[PDB]
Amino acid sequence: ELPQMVQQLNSPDQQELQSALRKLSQIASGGNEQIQAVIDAGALPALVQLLSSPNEQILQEALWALSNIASGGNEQIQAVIDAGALPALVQLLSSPNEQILQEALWALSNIASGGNEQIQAVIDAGALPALVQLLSSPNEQILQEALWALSNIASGGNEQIQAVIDAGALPALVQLLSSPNEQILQEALWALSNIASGGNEQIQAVIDAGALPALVQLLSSPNEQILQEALWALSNIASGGNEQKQAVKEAGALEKLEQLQSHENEKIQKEAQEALEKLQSH
Amino acid sequence: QMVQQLQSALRKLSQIASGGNEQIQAVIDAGALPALVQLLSSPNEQILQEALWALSNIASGGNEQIQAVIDAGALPALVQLLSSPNEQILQEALWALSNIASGGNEQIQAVIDAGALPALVQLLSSPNEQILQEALWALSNIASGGNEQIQAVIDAGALPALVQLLSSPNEQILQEALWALSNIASGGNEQIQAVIDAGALPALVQLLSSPNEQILQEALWALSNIASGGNEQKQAVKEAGALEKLEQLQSHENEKIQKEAQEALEKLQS
Amino acid sequence: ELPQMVQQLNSPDQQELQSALRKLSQIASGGNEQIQAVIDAGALPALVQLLSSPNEQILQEALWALSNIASGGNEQIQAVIDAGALPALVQLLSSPNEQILQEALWALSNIASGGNEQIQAVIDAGALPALVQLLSSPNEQILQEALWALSNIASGGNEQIQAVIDAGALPALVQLLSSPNEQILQEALWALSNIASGGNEQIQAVIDAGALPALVQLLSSPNEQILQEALWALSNIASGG
């Protein structure tokens, strides 16, 4: 019975509540179909309500369930947003409890893994200032969690990318390119690459932030993994705002890049004339 | 699946518990561990997390698989990493270490003989709830072994920190600390008394006044294991004022709670 | 202005036809909402029929448009399937025209990038036997394209993975592990990893095929890129279903 659990989300019996929660986390896993069934049973209102709980045991598992639900499709992500989860998630980003912070960042990043509609909701909720603050954290675990969420946000449209820039993320990112920690370097380059996958305005901001000297320095690295990550980002920078020459750090991006080469031709037909005509009008 | 479990009920639950062990063993037979262990000394943090991921998966198999990890010499490196200020490296090593410690007594003893407890015990005082959870998990696994393994935990000085955490206003911390203590108290009377001497009973009794049914259920299991000891142990429980609260709970509205309070008053018989 | 072009997909004037075909491709490359507008205008039946065209110029741009439509959500992918495109698509995998072959493989990969229902439709249409044979190709461009489509199929459920195994993909994948071409190596490991991300049965097939000896050898590589790829695959195998 699924409604029994949903009912039991309002139970004052913490033992009966915790069982319905962890079981819901189990149901939320296993595909968007089970996710949708949870959504249809009307659980989200009570779920989000528990995000204000001072009971870390309940809060944790609650965030766990919301994250699973948010791992579904954009439609299923949007239901989470509609339920009103973002404002509570954003405030939890200031928590001194690293356990809660991870769960909050996990849920928030899954929401930011959807469409620009979902990404923009994250931005409109005020999540970027907190995320940027965390980039200065000496906790490598917190740092990864924050970059993961920022990366997903920077994977959207140019306006989303620009929001990230205006939030002051680039200075922290550039400083991390000097880290001797290859794991931090990967995470930082991942985020940068998504940011460099925007328009000329966005790319120029990366340059103005002093990213190139560090990227250039890494081209000499004997670490093939660093090399790929550095080249990826620099390649996006050298794209000139042309999204057919950019690739967001996601599966299928390089394959798509190759396919677009054999179809930019008719798109390159009109650039060459724009070049000749503009020159002939010197 | 393991949760959902004349003799066919036995054999099914085997197939579940061991599902995947044959695959993990092939990886071992192929000779993957020497290289993985070699990679644990790398200063490249990206390689480290990748090697620890694979190693943890291997250590998720059966005791034979776990023992192969030990025989390959993984513990010295893992132990070294428990003192890292890199919270990312720390989580990865504790994960692998927990999986190893989730094995049999021989496996748990190897973890002990490698010198893991001192680092684990010192992390119990961490203000980082994330680290704390990971350290307790690993310690709970170690304390799930035999009396020798349990006593090693006690001799390492873990109980003082565990008793302190019982006063935590954090329910998640409380669950984690109670599970570890519940494992310590599942040993012989020597181990139960150590819990008693550490001052665990006063805090446990205080929790029996909690309105949180999940807390009660957690505290009831600890005392239950303490009440399985000898008359010296049962008595101390009575001294602390447990009987009072227990029978106050004899008629609690939660069915599962009632059986735990019942089964405890039962044990306190002699 | 959209139904006009759809009707022009049945035009006998090839220049009028090609012009409408190129703009549709451009609209479909502009997001799901633009993709749905095209579907709603009734373009799929006209596009699907152009998969029988003997005009390579038309076919390619029609494959290009369908590939973009297939880059949308699982709902928009399924419309392509329901329109009946897969049989004509799969048939093009036996083409000796590398230009047409690539475009066909991209469309299928996008289709196979949807839900397990979409992957299964690709399997039921008979796409696996062709893909497997292409793994023996000496053309590194074809090989990469075939390995991609296969990787998307192997990203589905254990049933989808098992279909790949039953088609005989593993023997070719294992041989590629010995390739000195790091690009081929990455492509093969990606596919192999997906297969190893299944149940114990699927994992055990990977073992029975002889993958471990090569994988273990790769762990000694000084190339950190190869190392990550090999560990990823090795980890999936050692997950225990």
Partner: peptide
């Protein structure tokens, strides 16, 4: 019980 992990491709 509550332990989580994840990784990224391309």
């Amino acid at each position: 019980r509550r332990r989580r992990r994840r990784r990224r491709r391309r």
